[PDB]
Each structure stands twice: as structure tokens, then as C-alpha cells.
């Protein structure tokens, strides 16, 4: 385990996220059951090379991290919430997760550093 890793995520938030708004929707109005859905498709279109993560997070995250194609920089232990921690340190380089789930909605992660 290094100090910090660098990923990029892809965000889904729905109605009951603990900010169930973004910069792409005024008002998340998805269920829980719908973000998982979209999130496993998304899954599904990029190991198929049908979809791009980055080029995904960048139209679809409701993160605003979307601007930067998803990138959340370099972070240690200790400062995001422990679920999207433990996934992205258990991480490889090159690594995308499953779904992750957070306070915040429903994450796919992808370790670049
Ligand atoms: O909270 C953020 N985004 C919120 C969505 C939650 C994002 C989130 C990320 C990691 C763990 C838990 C939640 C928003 O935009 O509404 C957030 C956090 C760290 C960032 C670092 C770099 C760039 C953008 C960033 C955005």
C-alpha cells in the first residue's frame, strides 16, 4: 500500500444520496434500484470496450469531477468515506472496481496512480 493513490470514479447519485442534486440534474429523482441499474451497464458497455470510463464519467458522473473526466487526484487514507477508501486502495493500477457504495451514491472506480 503507497501513501496515496490517484483514481478517477464515476458517481451515480439517486434520490436518497445524501446531496441528491448535481451538475448535471437540479434534482437526482432516480431510485436507488435505477442508479444501480445505470452503474452496472456502465459496468457492462466497458468491459465490453463498447464504452470509455473516462469519456462515461465526463458526460454521465454526477460528480463534478465529471470536468476533469473523473479524476479525484491523489488522496490518503482517512480522508474519503471508508467504503470508496477500502475500494481504492484495494485497487491495482489499471483497476476498475465493482460497484461501491457510499453516502454520497453508487461509484465505479478507476486506479490510475
Ligand atoms: O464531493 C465531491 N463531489 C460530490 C459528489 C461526491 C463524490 C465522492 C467522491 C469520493 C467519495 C465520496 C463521494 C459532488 O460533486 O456532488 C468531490 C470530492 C472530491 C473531489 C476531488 C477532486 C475533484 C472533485 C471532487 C469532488
Redesign the pocket.
Known sequence: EPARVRCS?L?V?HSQSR?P???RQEQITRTQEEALELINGYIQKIKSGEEDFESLASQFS????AK?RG???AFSRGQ??KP?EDASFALRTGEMSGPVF?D??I?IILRTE
Open positions: 470514479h458517481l447519485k446531496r442534486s448535481s451538475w454526477d460528480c463534478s469531477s476533469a479524476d479525484l487526484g474519503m468515506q470508496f457510499t454520497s451514491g461509484h
